[PDB]
Structures are given as C-alpha cells and as structure tokens.
C-alpha cells in the first residue's frame, strides 16, 4: 500500500476518461484533464499479461460399480472430492491474491507519477497537499506540456518564481 489512491489523493476523477492515471491543469488559458498515456499503456500491457498468465495456467464421466465394490467406489469418490477441493482452493486463493497485487500496482503508479512531477517542479511550486501544486510563476500551456512530457526547465523560471515565493 502506497497511500495515493485513497490517500493524499482522496477521490477519482470521472472527468478523466482518456486514461487511468493523469493530470488536471488550471492556467489562464483554461482548465482541462489529460491522461498520462505512457503509464496507462504500460499498465494495460502488464495487466493483460497478468490475466493471460492466470488463464494459461489452468489448461470426464463417472464410473459404475456393483454392490460388491463399495470400497473402490469410495476410493473414486474420495479422489474426485479431493481434487475438487484442491482446485476450488487454488482458484479462490489466486483471485484473492491477484486482486491485492493489482490494486497495489495501481497505487504505485499514481504515487510514482506524483513523485516524478514533484522532483521536476521542486521549489518553483507549492504542494497544496491534496495532490496538486500551485506554481509560483505564470506559465502557460507550453509549461504543462513540458511537465507532462518530462522536459521541464527549472532554470527558466527559477528567478521568476523566486520573487513570488
């Protein structure tokens, strides 16, 4: 557990519809939602592989006995019930563990996205605490495109952000 999905980000965005994890900006040019497509694509590939691996791992009639073969009939019944119990247990356990692993995977993705944006903005922005940063400089759509790509220019706004800080 990484404390992001139900942690410092306390709610999901129905507005976000282009991806699983993403970003919301509020410039002077307008508001918007925009998903992180690289993270979403990687997550989709990994989870598809997970489902396929669960599927690929899994892949009769009865016998009749007369009244003088009760021992062999009981042996057959024991074999059938034992295998049934083992396979039921395996299926339940696999689903239960895989679900937690998936949820933790999503939590890790969200937290890593937050970490990546933070290590890029540094002191030019302020952590509000709910999941967002308030920039100390007035930078436009090109700014948030750069932040999303990962090509933010800290020296470019370092001086401008210092007076407002």
């Amino acid at each position: 557990l990484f404390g992001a999905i139900a942690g410092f980000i306390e709610g999901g965005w129905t507005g976000m519809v282009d991806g699983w994890y993403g970003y919301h900006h509020q410039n002077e040019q307008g508001s918007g939602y925009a998903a992180d497509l690289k993270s979403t694509q990687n997550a989709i590939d990994k989870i598809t592989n997970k489902v396929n691996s669960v599927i690929e791992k899994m892949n009769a009639v009865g016998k009749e006995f007369n009244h003088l073969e009760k021992r062999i009939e009981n042996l057959n019944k024991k074999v059938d019930d034992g295998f049934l119990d083992i396979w039921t247990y395996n299926a339940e356990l696999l689903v239960l563990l895989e679900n937690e692993r998936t949820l933790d995977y999503h939590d890790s993705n969200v937290k890593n996205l937050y970490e990546k944006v933070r290590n890029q903005l540094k002191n030019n922005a302020k952590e509000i605490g709910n999941g967002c940063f308030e920039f100390y400089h007035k930078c436009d759509n090109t700014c948030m495109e750069s932040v999303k790509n990962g090509t933010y220019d800290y020296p470019k706004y370092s001086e401008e952000a210092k007076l407002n800080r």
Partner: antibody
Amino acid sequence: EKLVESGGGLVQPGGSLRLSCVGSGITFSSYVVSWVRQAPGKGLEWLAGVNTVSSISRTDYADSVKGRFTISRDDSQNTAYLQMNALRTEDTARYYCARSLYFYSMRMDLWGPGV
Amino acid sequence: QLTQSPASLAASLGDTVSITCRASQSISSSLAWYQQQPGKAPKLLIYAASSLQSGVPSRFKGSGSGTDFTLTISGLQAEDVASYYCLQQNSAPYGFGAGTKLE
C-alpha cells in the same frame, strides 16, 4: 486474440444491413470497438465507435454516417454491432472492426480481416 | 483535420523516406502510423507518435508533438512498398489521413 466480422453481402439501395464483430477471449468488456471502411480506390475512413459499458460517452459517429449508422454492443455474446440504414451506392466498401483496450487513446492494433 | 503529405512518393531501395502529417489543432502525441498492403488489414507501426510496436523493424521512426508529425523510414526495403496512413486518437470524431503510397 482475434476479431471476426460477419453479416455483409449485397443490399439494395435504401436498404439496411447489420454487421457483427465477434471476439475470441474472455476480455471483451475491455474492448473499445471501432469500425473502419475502405472504399475501392479511397483510403481508410473511420465510421463509428462503441465505448465500454461503464463510461460517459457511449457511442461516437463520424459526420458522414451520423444519423444513418448505429453502433451497439453485447458483451454477453462477445459481439459489437453496426446497423446501417438508408444505404447508398457510396457505401460499397470493405468494413473492418478494430479494438483498443479500455480507452480510445490506446493502440488500435487488433484488426479483423474485413467484409 | 489531418493533412498528410505527400499523396504519393517514389523512392529507391536503401533511401530515406519522410512522410509528414499536420493537424488542424493541437493533438498532444496522440498519433499512430499504419502500414497497409492492398486488400489486407492495416498494421500498426508507431503509436504515441514515437513508440515502436513490437515486431516492427527499427527502420521506422516517428517524431512530433503538437501539430507536426513525421514518419521516417531509413533503409527502405522491398517489403516496405505499401500505403501509409496517420490516425489521430484525441478528438471524439476520430479519423485517418488521406494516405501516402510508396513506390
């Protein structure tokens, strides 16, 4: 995985035709199914797209076929339907069904052979 | 919305080929390039405007962010003679480019 298109053929002008795209697998509710067509001597043309059941925008249509074509989905039978109404001569083409996973911003890399 | 250039382009083996796409408005990296051979289903080459699909040779590269995109084929081979289409995946009425034929 795989996608198979069925329900094509010859239709009189002004007629109707229902095309079906059936997928193999267990993850079909994840699919985001889109229809493309190629007229003889023209390029690819995106017609319609049906989203997943738990989503805001459920269907989307190109302007050239909006109001005439209707896209629909049946996840229990693993099928996506394109209902074409008031068919014209210019609708003669090869129809293909492609699928993206979960979102329309992801790879549309599973295509059907076409009808 | 999507203008693809040139409509046709004849090149020789071993050459370098550039196909350009221009969008009416800003689509942020949501472009895909498809190679189609006659009568067959299109085959994806580059998604996210720069990501190379598995199984596609590294001859194909893609570039562009906002409204100008480029598909570059370095070391053209005889099996690269096909049509090339550009797909946007940003605005609700999704669409293809006009198409480029390579000879």
